[PDB]
């Protein structure tokens, strides 16, 4: 599973220290995780805010080429390091050799 940093785009706009958004963009970011190895290498899903933060869509998509635990296992290393690529963003995309994911405010 081929984890290698590719591309990125940041919101030059960061989510501000302790922002609802970190809930449900968190929260988001695991149905993406969780679920597009089974929703066919692509997958796209939401989460409304609570506390007057915005809505949150996101897109992953994996390497067709690659298994079921490795699509789920790039997300997750990817996850975990978008957050540093973009030093916390309202908004990212990232692009790695197996996997791609994209966060917005808005839908996209
Ligand atoms: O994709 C993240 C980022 O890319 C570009 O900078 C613009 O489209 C931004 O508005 C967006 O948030």
């Known amino acids: 599973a081929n984890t290698a940093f590719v591309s990125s785009a940041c919101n030059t706009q960061k989510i501000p220290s302790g922002s609802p958004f970190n809930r449900n963009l968190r929260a988001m970011l695991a149905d993406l995780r969780q679920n597009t190895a089974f929703s066919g290498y692509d997958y796209k899903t939401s989460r409304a805010g609570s506390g007057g ?5 996101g897109r992953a998509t994996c390497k067709q080429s690659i298994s079921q635990s490795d699509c789920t296992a790039c997300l997750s290393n990817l996850v975990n390091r978008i957050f540093s690529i973009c030093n916390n963003a309202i908004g990212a995309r990232v692009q790695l050799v197996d ?10």
């Open 53 to 57: 933060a915005p809505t949150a869509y």
């Open 99 to 108: 996997c791609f994911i994209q966060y917005e405010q808005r839908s996209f």
